[PDB]
Amino acid sequence: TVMKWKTVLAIFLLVVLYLIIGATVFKALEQPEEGLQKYRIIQEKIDFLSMHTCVQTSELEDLVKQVVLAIRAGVNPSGHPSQESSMWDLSSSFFFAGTVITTIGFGNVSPHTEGGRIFCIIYALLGIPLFGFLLAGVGDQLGTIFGKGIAKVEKMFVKWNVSQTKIRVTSTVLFILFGCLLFVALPALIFQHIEGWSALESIYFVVITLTTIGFGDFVAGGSEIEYLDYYKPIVWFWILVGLAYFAAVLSMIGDWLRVISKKTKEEVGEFRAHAA
Amino acid sequence: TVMKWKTVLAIFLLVVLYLIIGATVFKALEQPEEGLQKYRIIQEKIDFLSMHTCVQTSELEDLVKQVVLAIRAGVNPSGHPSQESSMWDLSSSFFFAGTVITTIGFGNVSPHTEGGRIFCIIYALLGIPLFGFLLAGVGDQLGTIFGKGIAKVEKMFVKWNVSQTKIRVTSTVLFILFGCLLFVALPALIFQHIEGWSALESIYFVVITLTTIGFGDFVAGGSEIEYLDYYKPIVWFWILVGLAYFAAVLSMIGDWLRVISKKTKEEVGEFRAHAA
Ligand SMILES: CCCCCCCC/C=C\CCCCCCCC(=O)O[C@H](COC(=O)CCCCCCCCCCCCCCC)COP(=O)(O)O
Ligand SMILES: CCCCCCCC/C=C\CCCCCCCC(=O)O[C@H](COC(=O)CCCCCCCCCCCCCCC)COP(=O)(O)O
Ligand SMILES: [K+]
Ligand SMILES: [K+]
Ligand SMILES: [K+]
Ligand SMILES: [K+]
């Protein structure tokens, strides 16, 4: 408790170095794709203006602006969207309120109005503590159930005499393998089958959603197709349990980082001490 | 610790009721705006096809699809974007990596490639514990500095004799007022002046960003204008300190919810006991 001011500066420098490395890698990987996309869109527009004589550049840019505002407003520009197929229905509003309290915030659906934004601010402010409580309760229940399960597994295991060492390592590898299998390996398959995504896109969606980053480029609910009535409830249940499992996994990764930090500190101190 | 299975069910029912209420309110507020937007875009397209004879509906829908894919790819359709003005530069990649580790995830900038997505998954998985450590350290430092400040304020206050009661209430109101003034009241003014947003949009942006929901509809960095060189670093510093202040405020709101829960439980038990 009460981390010293010297440790905070070192952690800050480590974080800034991590950001510099991530920025370099992202910049190196992502510039060519954006260059090709820019040439593709410019060539598409010049092709359209070449093919159609009547159109002129000012009107075409005005139409492109209208389309961009249409996407900003949340309405689909392409096709004739039916009035009955409202995107703000109770199932979608339920999904939106769940993302707000969860703090995933995909962003495909946004308020866009003064009253929606005010109610979003008050609703989020009240909502986050309540979900934090629910998540802590679900995490504790999951932890006790898994702990009793591996307690009886270990108890049965005592028939074949085994060293006390590596029993925790094996229990942890079993936890990681079962958790990834049940949370990332299977929902990725269901999402891929019901939506046409690729395996990497499905894994990326599961990781971004459960980690609560929620970029919004890949959203399970939002597509120009019709799903089953119970698809969204099942997705929310997978999200609720996955959030607990990922929070636990992140805590374990943090614990590993601390040990590596303590080990590095003692090793550096020992090398300093003999070095003289 | 180890929340009972009965409490978890009650918290789950409360959360589901909260989502039903939020969904109803959001649906009631947001349907008309979407209806008007849908009519506006349909009327704009039929007006364009009426004004231009040469254009036909299949080609116009194809052009709208090309524009929609251009927005999905992250490139601006409207205007001629210069090749030099890359959106994936080190300043932007730094902003993106900061949102990934922070878990705000605005979503304006996304990987879009197999290597970007794989590196995003590994980078986030390592990054979140490190930021959690940095955030805890900054929160502890802020708490100790504020605690010593109000310690000396209280010590000076003892000249005028005051009741021991309400001293904590006054310190907490002072903390809330100073924190909102310095974190939400002023950055909203700077964002509004440098970007043209309204006051409600600025307050909404600050709340969504610091709460880590990060919808992405309002992003300080992304606009079709040029800012000062140091604008993004100052924004990141405001985000780093704001995250600690909001985490503290959310913890206080959670503590208030717990007390109201304990008070409600004892009041219901007492009413049950006498009721007979
Ligand atoms: C993080 C918190 C975890 C919570 C996860 C559990 C989810 C709780 C459950 C249920 C439903 C919540 C809102 C449903 C309101 C439906 C009202 C309705 O009319 O359905 C319409 C939706 O359209 C549909 O009918 C089909 C699509 C969604 C399903 C409709 C209602 C749910 C029925 C089946 C699934 C619920 C539970 C299944 C359990 C596996 C909305 O249009 P409108 O109202 O304007 O007419
Ligand atoms: C949550 C963590 C909190 C961290 C907050 C502190 C931020 C740490 C600081 C600094 C800069 C990090 C990346 C900058 C790399 C700039 C390289 C560069 O050339 O600048 C170009 C950006 O364009 C510009 O020159 C102007 C726009 C951004 C500023 C450029 C560099 C920073 C100079 C001033 C501000 C830094 C610190 C000011 C302190 C108030 C990138 O284009 P390219 O590389 O392809 O040629
Ligand atoms: K988020
Ligand atoms: K987000
Ligand atoms: K988050
Ligand atoms: K987002």
Author numbering:
A (entry chain A), B (entry chain B): 40 to 315
Task: Pull text from the paper.
For the mechanosensitive subfamily of K2Ps (including the TREK1, TREK2, and TRAAK channels), diverse stimuli control channel activity, including lipids, pH, heat, membrane tension, post-translational modification, and an array of pharmacologically active agents including volatile anesthetics, antidepressants, and neuroprotective agents. Overall, this cryo-EM structure exhibits K2P architectural features consistent with prior crystallographic studies: a dimeric channel assembly with each subunit composed of four transmembrane helices, a domain-swapped cap located above the selectivity filter, and an extended membrane facing TM2/TM3 loop within each subunit.
There are two POPA binding sites where the lipid density interacts directly with the core of the protein. We find that the presence of a lipid tail in the upper binding site forces an inward reorientation of the W275 sidechain toward the core of the protein, moving it closer to the G137 residue. An array of basic residues from both TM4 and TM1 surround the negatively charged headgroup of the PA lipid, suggesting a clear electrostatic basis for the binding of PA and other anionic lipids at this site. The S300 residue, a protein kinase C phosphorylation target in the proximal C-terminus of TREK144, lies directly in the center of the lower POPA binding site, 4.8 Å away from the well-resolved POPA headgroup. In this location, phosphorylation of S300 would be predicted to create both electrostatic and steric clashes with the headgroup of a bound anionic lipid and would disfavor the anionic lipid bound TM4 “up” state.
